[PDB]
Design a protein that fits this description.
The protein has about 140 residues and is mostly beta strands. Helices cover about 5% and strands about 45% of the residues. It has two domains: about 40 residues, no CATH class; about 100 residues, no CATH class. It binds zinc ion (ZN). Homodimer.
Length: about 140
């Protein structure tokens, strides 16, 4: 579990979005595993605007933050998980590291701020849904 809170937006894994998220929907994209809902309070997070490939992610199944190198966001084939079938996912970054389904929502951060959230795992990789292209998260 986990979310990004930027302005009056809440950014979550689409597959973990609540009824309250869907009832206050700003934007969602199944191909990216992302959903953004509206919030009443303002959030503590800054979105990175950059092409960093090094950062640190939170792994709930280890209660640890790990430094990683990661690929630039791309269209990747993901094997079946407890929450999705085998499929192609867009805007996905991969790193070598530990990820279980419940790790989804952990933040990946760089020197510039929040890069994305854990979205995929298995076979010694962790996948992160990028948010750095969502420039609209910082206005309106
Ligand atoms: Zn950066």
């Amino acid at each position: 579990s986990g979310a990004i809170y930027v302005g009056n937006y809440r950014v979550v894994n689409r597959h973990l979005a609540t009824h309250n998220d869907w009832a206050n929907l700003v934007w969602e994209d199944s191909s990216r595993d992302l959903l953004v809902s509206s919030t009443t309070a303002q959030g503590c997070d800054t979105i990175a605007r950059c092409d960093c490939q090094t950062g640190v992610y939170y792994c709930s199944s280890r209660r640890k933050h790990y430094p990683v190198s990661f690929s630039k966001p791309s269209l990747i084939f993901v094997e079946a998980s407890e929450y999705y079938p085998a499929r192609y996912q867009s805007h996905l970054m991969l790193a070598v590291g530990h990820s279980e389904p419940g790790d989804c929502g952990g933040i990946l951060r760089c020197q510039h701020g929040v890069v994305g959230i854990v979205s995929t795992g298995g076979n010694g990789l962790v996948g992160f849904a990028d948010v750095r292209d969502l420039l609209w998260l910082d206005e309106e």
